[PDB]
Amino acid sequence: LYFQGSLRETSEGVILSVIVAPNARETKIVGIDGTRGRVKVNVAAPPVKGKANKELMKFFKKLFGAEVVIVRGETSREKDLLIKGITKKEVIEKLEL
Numbered sequence: 001l002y003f004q005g006s007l008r009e010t011s012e013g014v015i016l017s018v019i020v021a022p023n024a025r026e027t028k029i030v031g032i033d034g035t036r037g038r039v040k041v042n043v044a045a046p047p048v049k050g051k052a053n054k055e056l057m058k059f060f061k062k063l064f065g066a067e068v069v070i071v072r073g074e075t076s077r078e079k080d081l082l083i084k085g086i087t088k089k090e091v092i093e094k095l096e097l
């Protein structure tokens with residue numbers, strides 16, 4: 001399994017497709033879902049008042065050094081994140097760290 005199955009590069013940056021589990025001990029990448037083409041992300045926040053979405057975005061903004069917005073799935077576990085102004089090569093390097 002490679003992270004490439006969860007990413008695609010658009011004119012605006014990289015869409016990173018994730019599947020979250022809230023209430024986690026630590027916000028971190030725990031795996032890849034090879035059927036859904038998504039990175040499994042544990043989020044150390046409750047899924048109330050948008051707090052899991054906020055923590056998810058904060059985690060990836062820090063990892064990538066780039067603005068991260070949710071473009072689909074604000075109220076779903078399966079969320080698509082636009083990482084603005086970054087290339088797929090840069091995203092792969094950071095996910096592989």
Ligand code: NA
Nearest residue numbers: 050051052053
């Ligand atoms: Na949330």
